[PDB]
Design an enzyme around this catalytic site. Structure first.
Site, mmCIF file in Angstrom:
data_model
loop_
_atom_site.group_PDB
_atom_site.id
_atom_site.type_symbol
_atom_site.label_atom_id
_atom_site.label_comp_id
_atom_site.label_asym_id
_atom_site.label_seq_id
_atom_site.Cartn_x
_atom_site.Cartn_y
_atom_site.Cartn_z
ATOM 1 C CB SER A 24 -0.991 0.042 1.262
ATOM 2 O OG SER A 24 -1.710 -1.276 1.007
ATOM 3 C CG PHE A 25 1.982 2.775 3.302
ATOM 4 C CD1 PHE A 25 1.154 4.113 3.350
ATOM 5 C CD2 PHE A 25 1.290 1.712 3.922
ATOM 6 C CE1 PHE A 25 0.307 4.219 4.368
ATOM 7 C CE2 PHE A 25 0.238 1.961 4.835
ATOM 8 C CZ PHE A 25 -0.323 3.390 4.951
ATOM 9 C CB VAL A 28 6.613 -5.825 0.392
ATOM 10 C CG1 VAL A 28 6.407 -6.952 1.150
ATOM 11 C CG2 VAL A 28 5.478 -4.851 0.713
ATOM 12 N NE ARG A 144 -7.297 -9.869 -3.182
ATOM 13 C CZ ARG A 144 -8.631 -10.275 -2.948
ATOM 14 N NH1 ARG A 144 -8.810 -11.330 -3.770
ATOM 15 N NH2 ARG A 144 -9.605 -9.453 -2.345
ATOM 16 C CG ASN A 145 -4.959 -9.901 1.356
ATOM 17 O OD1 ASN A 145 -3.930 -9.602 1.211
ATOM 18 N ND2 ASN A 145 -6.025 -9.269 1.184
HETATM 19 C C1 ICV Z 1 2.866 -7.139 2.976
HETATM 20 C C2 ICV Z 1 3.221 -7.958 4.126
HETATM 21 C C3 ICV Z 1 4.820 -8.137 4.570
HETATM 22 C C4 ICV Z 1 2.517 -7.243 5.445
HETATM 23 O O1 ICV Z 1 2.596 -6.398 5.965
HETATM 24 N N1 ICV Z 1 1.727 -8.305 6.029
HETATM 25 C C5 ICV Z 1 0.844 -8.249 7.109
HETATM 26 C C6 ICV Z 1 0.653 -9.278 7.789
HETATM 27 C C7 ICV Z 1 -0.079 -9.513 8.920
HETATM 28 C C8 ICV Z 1 -1.157 -8.080 9.214
HETATM 29 S S1 ICV Z 1 -2.030 -8.200 10.557
HETATM 30 O O2 ICV Z 1 -2.564 -6.651 10.807
HETATM 31 O O3 ICV Z 1 -1.545 -8.688 11.509
HETATM 32 C C9 ICV Z 1 -3.570 -8.894 9.712
HETATM 33 F F1 ICV Z 1 -3.277 -10.280 9.387
HETATM 34 F F2 ICV Z 1 -4.197 -8.365 8.722
HETATM 35 F F3 ICV Z 1 -4.678 -9.084 10.787
HETATM 36 C C10 ICV Z 1 -0.854 -7.198 8.109
HETATM 37 C C11 ICV Z 1 0.041 -7.199 7.249
HETATM 38 C C12 ICV Z 1 1.703 -9.651 5.052
HETATM 39 O O4 ICV Z 1 1.030 -10.500 5.304
HETATM 40 N N2 ICV Z 1 2.616 -9.168 4.228
HETATM 41 C C13 ICV Z 1 2.813 -10.243 3.360
HETATM 42 C C14 ICV Z 1 3.855 -11.296 3.551
HETATM 43 C C15 ICV Z 1 4.222 -11.685 5.013
HETATM 44 C C16 ICV Z 1 5.317 -12.646 5.320
HETATM 45 N N3 ICV Z 1 5.632 -13.292 4.262
HETATM 46 C C17 ICV Z 1 5.328 -13.145 3.031
HETATM 47 N N4 ICV Z 1 5.673 -14.126 2.037
HETATM 48 C C18 ICV Z 1 5.213 -13.676 0.697
HETATM 49 C C19 ICV Z 1 4.172 -12.339 0.921
HETATM 50 C C20 ICV Z 1 4.598 -12.254 2.596
#
Ligand code: ICV
Ligand code: NI
Ligand code: ZN
Length: 275
Positions: A24-25, A28, A144-145
């Protein structure tokens, strides 16, 4: 402003390698971090950056979004490991999910057992029950998330809405923000109401993704046609070869009245009463 704390990591402890995709910002990356896990000299990490161009306002938005994660202690939510708020670029480092996002992993499979599909479903529901218990509404739950570990464990993450690979999963409704309209509840589409109950709707679309190996929901309908179809009470068809138990779970998640949908705690119970 943002007040630095014990999660701060010195920047020299962090190394970047290849990119993971557009956040988003900012970009990565994958990388390695020294001194972030106990008994571990080196840890493979995901590194989330802010563009140099971004405003000080948007930097603080990025940090305060990662600060939510400081409260989390669930092995089915991607784990925060550190923050770099001192100097440029602003970083946050997390646990690296070596097999990437669940949409990508499912596409790669193109015959899972009810067993493997229900195991994934239960892992996702574990992380979503935890988040919703901590007042966190995800708003973009989708394969995807979801993220896949080396051992094939699934965890809740969030890669934002801007990766080129999933451009077809977002609609700029009225020219405004991107919306994941094919994953959104009726009430989210109609009134912009996002709740734990709308997360459960989206969970039912994630089950459909598991059972289709991540076909596009409502293939053949445009975004405007999806809005109308879903708000008028239309549903995704049962996937070809879908087990009865998984489709029944999808149908529960797609009750039109959000108060009629199971909670994630109720989903975990009914998956545990099969096991
Ligand atoms: C972009 C990024 C790094 C990130 O910031 N997050 C993220 C993780 C957790 C949260 S959270 O707020 O705890 C939730 F889950 F939404 F509740 C927010 C964002 C990701 O998943 N990411 C992809 C990611 C993470 C690790 N290993 C990876 N390998 C391939 C993509 C990938
Ligand atoms: Ni578990
Ligand atoms: Zn902003």
């Amino acid at each position: 402003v943002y007040v630095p704390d014990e999660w701060e990591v010195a920047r020299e402890k962090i190394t970047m390698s290849r990119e993971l995709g557009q956040g988003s910002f900012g970009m990565v990356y994958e990388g390695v971090a020294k001194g972030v896990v106990k008994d571990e000299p080196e840890t493979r990490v995901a590194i989330k950056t802010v563009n140099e161009a971004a405003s000080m306002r948007e930097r603080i938005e990025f940090l305060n979004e990662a600060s939510v994660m400081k409260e989390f202690n669930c092995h089915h939510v991607v784990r925060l490991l550190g923050v770099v708020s001192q100097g440029q670029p602003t970083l946050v480092i997390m646990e690296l999910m070596t097999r990437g996002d669940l949409k990508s992993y499912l596409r790669s499979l193109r015959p899972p057992s009810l067993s493997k599909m229900i195991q994934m479903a239960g892992e996702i529901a574990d992380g979503m029950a935890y988040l919703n218990a901590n007042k966190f509404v995800h708003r973009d739950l989708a394969a995807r998330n979801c993220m896949v570990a080396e051992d094939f464990t699934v965890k809740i993450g969030d890669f934002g809405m801007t990766r080129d690979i999933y451009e077809t999963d977002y609609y700029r409704k009225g020219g405004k923000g991107l919306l994941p309209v094919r994953w959104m509840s009726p009430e989210s589409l109609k009134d912009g109401v996002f709740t734990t109950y709308s997360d459960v709707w989206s969970f039912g679309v994630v089950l459909w993704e598991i059972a289709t190996l991540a076909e596009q929901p409502y293939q053949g309908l445009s975004n405007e046609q999806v809005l109308r179809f879903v708000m008028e009470g239309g549903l995704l068809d049962k996937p070809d070869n879908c087990p009865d138990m998984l489709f029944e779970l999808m149908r529960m998640c797609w009750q039109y009245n959000p108060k009629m949908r199971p909670s994630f705690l109720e989903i975990i119970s009914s998956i545990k009463e099969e096991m």
